[PDB]
Design a binder for this molecule. Structure first.
Ligand code: WJW
Ligand code: Y75
Lengths: 327, 238, 316, 239
């Protein structure tokens, strides 16, 4: 227990220190980029508030690389002090130390979950305000609905619904000027100009989610909205990529921590602390580039984004396990 | 108990630093794995410890093969290791340092774990620093704490890497007494160190390894009067 | 022989660092460009041309930083393996070793002058022309599978799309002219198994054909006109910018003293941040001159302030 | 020439590691700066070299102050340094290793520089391996090349850090012969080493540094017979 507490506390302190350092270094580096966007209504204080409100998002996007670098630094501090060697010499396996470091990284995993569900969706809205959909086009089965204005409270302005059959022939082109939402599957409206050659599946609750990019949506919102679209429509590939990227974020963090531990016990053993930090930065940049590139490639290639998202994670986990097996 | 090691061989950069290094040890016996620097004593000792993977050879501990086992598995089988460099837990107190390894023992409960901690602290005269951090103690006190921590795991063979490294001649007697006490505790000791003169004073069986192979075997007196060893390692005058 | 040894070491490690930093800092932007292309806002077959035309612009930052890191790597290696203790112990100081590399620093300064005065403006001109060519794409060029894309008076939905942005499936197009086609291949687009409607006219068809900067100016044109604050800022940047390899020489000498245990890469991050601060000041000054608030005189001074402060740090 | 060092003192993290360390070493004299580990012998040796800056004290070389001079300036004044670890230029030939420091000498031309290179290679028996890289040589050959390069620097006082470090007893005699050869060359030698026994065999004047101050002085016989050193450093039983 004392060994476990010591390793977990040291690695958690390393992760938290790296997290604070990286969040500060990204806030003060995004502020530099934002200082060139100043105008009459966007002063330096407004830009600082916009960057600061985005701090939870920067933290959420840093937690994987933060955990990787923190594990690297903490295990390097233990190894350079010859603490891991005596830990092995007393009967503690490599996988036990890796499990302790993973227990330490579970705090960052929980922090990532809390940010993604409760903090990031709210502060992102605040950040945009410092700096509800119009012209919404949607498909419901064989019908196409274009609503010029849609409101979260249940207001529709200039709706146009065009129906179709399996033969793709016009059936009804209905239009209205104003409309209200009363229940699922039915909307009241005035000026019911229905052509011939009511029920619509749009829901106000998801209206605010249309403008938001799939990456910026919280997991609960993404699942609810994606469930709604799969029920009434076809889910786009970018939404599937976002879902597989969010559901595999804790797994990616744990795998990156395991890779850091394997590197410390393997290639990065007896190396200097500066070299370990440089290699940790290189691995973090490589991970942040591979995940982004494969996410983009999932949107252009036939295979499902699940493959492009769970490929790097599984492969890195296998590589780390093999490096740990080599001791 | 006996530790037999046969035909150790390891190559680095396609050259065999160690070629057929074999030696035998017994519990409560001091054995010195000596030889010219870089000729394979360090690599052979590390393969015995488990730091360096074994390309060729067989390690048995009382007809129990340890060649395929890893470092931690060998440690659980009854092998302890004492690194030359400072290996104390810097942020843990000396009492916590020993108790951290005492908790690993499965055949002790807390009531006897505390007693074992107290008697280990009193054995090495480190009770006065039991509440002090491991990174704020003297070299000798830190080494005694490391030895107590290693013995807290109850090893059957202690593998010491250069105990007489950076040790004044006044404090060489203390290290010799500590190693003699380790022998008297029923635990064999394998010492590897470049200071052959005071390593041959406590070791009761010495193996000299040169050119990657064992060139001599026997007591330190026999080692000194060995033509090959004086030809390669100790010189004409010693 | 010490000079040739140091020059060879610095050239090798600095070329390695320059290639590595080029890979790192161009792969990220190329991945961003590839994401843009996968969103249909950029041709996937041209993004390589985009990153090739920005080779000089990225290199104008990688060269001062790559040389700085290579100098740090060489000097830190000399310190770690005790090759500096014997060089200092033989009467050759660290400042003397840095001065032995003045010809190499001048070679890199000439290279960076070539990039910033000629190569970078040409690359930026070609990249701006290419971006202007790629900023006009509209219509079925911007379509994404299972999504509605609105461009001008056009609304486009495609149920499927190939690996390349051709061979669309389940195509719905809205102007008003509404066309629903089973297949479409690419603005000249051939639609197969389609229906056209006017909202009321109907027409079925088996096949149909649908038909819906100062930074890049040449140095010759910017050598004069120093009165214009924007032109003055750009030209002074092009002139007083290549002198960041002289400041990367006398400062990497100052911030390279590392103990053998400390490591060769220990002092990189703080001094890389110091060099980044130098460059960030050189960019804030450039912007201030562009806004007609500071004047060109701040270009050399910003270097001299870092030139002196480094030199004093090398002589403490 | 007489290098005289007076009142060395240095503190590290509010702890006075070295307190009033003074000693004199003449040219052509082997002087051993020994003592218990961490008691200030290594720090005093480094401040004599110039690796770590002094906090109090002065150094003179025939009324020529070296206290404020940097390490390279002292080296130009005639002080060479031999580190314990492998300090050879890894990617430079041994002949190139010696020549690169020979080219620094302003009192030698190419015709004389080549002759000096040849005779330095001959004297240290490294001519046979004059075409190999510094990183691909044996430990003894590497140390011989480093000493030849240091002599090519033309020093008046050579400060050796742990010459008998990681050295077999067979090579201890060879290193002793090397140090005696440097003595016979008119170059004083200041040796610091953990191995007190073998260091005391060639040094003709030993300074024992304990608790940050010099407690003993004189020939190794006096050092061994000194009761204070045996009480703090050597022990009652020592040979
Ligand atoms: C001798 C002299 C020598 C020196 C010479 C000079 C120097 C060399 C010169 C060479 C040339 C050069 O520059 O070379 C590069 C730089 C070289 C380095 C700098 C100089 C250093 C000098 C000192 C050394 C290239 C460059 O600079 O490319 C820009 C790009 N920048 C980056 O990519 C920077 C980062 C990092 C750079 C760091 C420094 C490296 C060198 C040391 O990577 C790289 O360099 C690549 C590589 O990996 C670097 C390797 C790093 C490691 C190196 C190690 C070396 C050894 C030590 C830009 O990215 C957008 C954002 O990307 C990420 O954030 P994110 O993911 O959240 O989105 C970035 N964060 C991250 O990655 C996360 C990082 C943070 C960084 C950490 C750094 C640590 C060191 O932490 C981590 O990783 C965690 C781990 C690490 C932690 C920290 C340790 C954000 O970083 C920042 O803030 C940081 C700053 O830059 C400052 C940099 C540091 C300075 C010290 C970024 O700002 O996008 C730009 C284009 O931008 C547009 C475009 O104009 O086309 C616009 C853009 O819109 C927005 C915006 O979002 O930004 C919003 C908008 O409102 C407005 O405000 C708008 C805008 O403000 C004003 O217009 O900006 C976006 O557009 C759209 C979109 O649809 O999406 C529509 C938007 O809306 C529309 O906009 C229109 C418009 O305005 O046009 C308008 O008309 C419309 O009406 C409007 N409609 C509506 C409806 O509104 C909006 O919807 C938006 C949406 O929200 C999504 O973004 O999207 C975008 C599009 O995405 C593109 O695809 O397009 C590129 O410019 P471009 O190349 O010229 O092109
Ligand atoms: C607005 N700028 C641009 O054009 C560059 C692109 C440069 C190449 C264009 N092909 N865009 C960017 O900012 C993109 C992100 C958004 C992209 N839209 N990446 C960031 C970046 C890249 C390169 C250089 N700095 C930066 S960030 C920066 C830095 Cl490090 C330091 C200070 C300042 C600053 C200046 C004045 C001020 N009051 N507050 C702040 C900034 C802000 N940025 C800027 O001032 C620069 C000024 C500039 C113009 N020409 C240059 C040529 C070389 C170097 C700099 C410049």
């Amino acid at each position: 227990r004392i060994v476990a507490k010591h390793v977990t506390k040291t690695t958690a302190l390393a992760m938290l220190g790296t997290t604070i350092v990286l969040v500060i270094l990204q806030v003060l580096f995004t502020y530099l980029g934002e200082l060139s966007n100043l105008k009459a209504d966007y002063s330096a204080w407004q830009a600082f508030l916009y960057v600061l409100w985005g701090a939870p998002r920067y933290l959420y996007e840093i937690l994987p690389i933060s955990a990787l670098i923190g594990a690297i630094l903490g295990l390097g501090t233990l190894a350079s002090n010859s603490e891991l060697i005596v830990m092995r010499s007393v009967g503690i396996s490599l996988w036990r130390i890796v499990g302790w470091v993973i227990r330490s990284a579970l705090v960052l995993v929980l922090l990532s979950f809390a940010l993604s569900e409760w903090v990031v969706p709210y502060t992102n809205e605040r950040a945009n305000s410092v700096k509800e959909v119009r012209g919404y086009w949607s498909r419901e089965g064989q019908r196409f609905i274009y609503v010029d204005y849609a409101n979260s409270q249940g207001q529709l302005k200039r709706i146009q619904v065009v129906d179709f059959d399996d033969n793709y022939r016009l059936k009804s082109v209905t239009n209205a000027e104003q409309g209200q939402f009363v229940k699922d599957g039915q909307w009241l409206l005035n000026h019911s100009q229905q052509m011939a050659i009511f029920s619509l599946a749009l829901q106000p609750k998801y209206v605010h989610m249309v403008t938001i990019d799939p990456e910026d949506l919280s997991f609960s919102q993404l699942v609810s909205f994606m469930n709604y679209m799969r029920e009434y429509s076809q889910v786009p590939k970018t939404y599937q990529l976002a879902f597989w990227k969010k559901v595999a974020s804790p797994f990616a963090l744990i795998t990156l921590v395991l890779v850091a531990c394997s590197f410390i016990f393997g290639p990065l053993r007896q190396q200097s602390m500066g070299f370990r930090l440089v290699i940790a930065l290189f691995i973090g940049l490589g991970f942040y580039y591979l995940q982004d590139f494969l996410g983009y490639a999932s949107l252009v290639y036939n295979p499902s984004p699940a493959w492009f998202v769970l490929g790097p994670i599984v492969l890195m986990f296998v590589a780390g396990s093999y490096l740990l097996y080599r001791a | 108990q006996t530790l037999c090691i046969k035909h150790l061989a390891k190559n680095y950069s396609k050259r065999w630093v160690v070629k057929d290094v074999s030696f035998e040890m017994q519990s409560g016996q001091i054995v010195g794995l000596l030889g010219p620097n870089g000729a394979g004593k360090t690599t052979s000792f590390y393969m015995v410890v488990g730091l360096v993977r074994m390309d060729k050879g067989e390690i048995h501990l009382d007809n129990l093969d340890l060649s395929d086992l890893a470092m931690h598995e060998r440690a659980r089988k009854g092998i302890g290791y004492l690194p030359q460099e400072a290996s104390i837990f810097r942020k843990l107190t000396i009492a916590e340092n020993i108790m951290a390894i005492l908790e690993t023992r499965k055949d002790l409960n807390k009531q006897q774990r505390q007693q074992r901690l107290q008697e280990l602290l009193n054995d090495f005269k480190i009770t006065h620093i039991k509440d002090s951090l491991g990174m704020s103690v003297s070299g000798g006190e830190r080494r005694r704490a490391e030895i107590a921590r290693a013995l807290a795991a109850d090893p059957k063979f202690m593998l010491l890497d250069e105990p007489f490294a950076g040790v004044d001649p006044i404090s060489v007697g203390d290290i010799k007494d500590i190693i003699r006490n380790l022998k008297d505790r029923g635990i064999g000791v394998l010492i590897t160190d470049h200071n052959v003169r005071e390593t041959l004073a406590i070791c009761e069986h010495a193996y000299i390894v040169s050119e990657g192979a064992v060139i001599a075997e026997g007591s330190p007196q026999d080692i000194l009067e060995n033509e090959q060893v004086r030809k390669v390692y100790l010189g004409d005058d010693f | 022989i010490i000079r040739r040894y140091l020059v060879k070491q610095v050239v090798s490690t600095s070329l390695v660092v320059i290639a590595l930093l080029t890979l790192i800092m161009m792969g990220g932007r190329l991945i961003k460009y590839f994401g843009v292309a996968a969103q249909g806002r950029l041709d996937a077959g041209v993004l390589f041309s985009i990153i090739g035309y920005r080779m000089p612009e990225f290199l104008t930052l990688i060269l001062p930083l790559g040389f700085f890191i290579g100098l740090m790597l060489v000097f830190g290696r000399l310190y770690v393996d005790h090759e500096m203790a014997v060089l200092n112990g033989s009467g050759i100081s660290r400042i003397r070793l840095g001065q032995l590399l003045i010809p190499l620093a001048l070679v890199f300064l000439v290279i960076q002058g070539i990039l910033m005065l000629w190569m970078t403006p040409w690359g930026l001109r070609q990249f701006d022309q290419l971006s202007s060519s790629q900023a006009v794409r509209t219509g079925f060029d911007l379509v994404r599978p299972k999504e509605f894309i609105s461009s001008g008076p056009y609304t486009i939905y495609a149920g499927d799309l190939s690996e390349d942005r051709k061979n669309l499936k389940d195509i719905f197009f809205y102007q008003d002219v509404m066309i629903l086609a089973k297949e479409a291949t690419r603005n000249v687009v051939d639609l197969i198994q389609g229906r056209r409607y006017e909202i009321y006219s109907q027409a079925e068809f088996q096949r149909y054909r649908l038909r819906l900067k100062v930074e890049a100016l040449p140095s010759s044109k910017l050598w004069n006109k120093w009165n214009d604050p924007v032109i003055a800022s750009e030209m002074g940047w092009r002139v007083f910018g290549p002198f960041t390899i002289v400041i990367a020489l006398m400062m990497a000498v100052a911030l390279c003293e590392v103990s053998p245990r400390q490591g060769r890469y220990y002092r990189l991050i703080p001094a890389i941040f110091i060099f980044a601060s130098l460059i960030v000041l050189l960019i804030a000054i450039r912007t201030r001159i562009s806004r007609d608030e500071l004047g060109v005189w701040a270009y050399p001074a910003a270097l001299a302030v870092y030139g002196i402060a480094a030199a004093l740090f090398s002589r403490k």
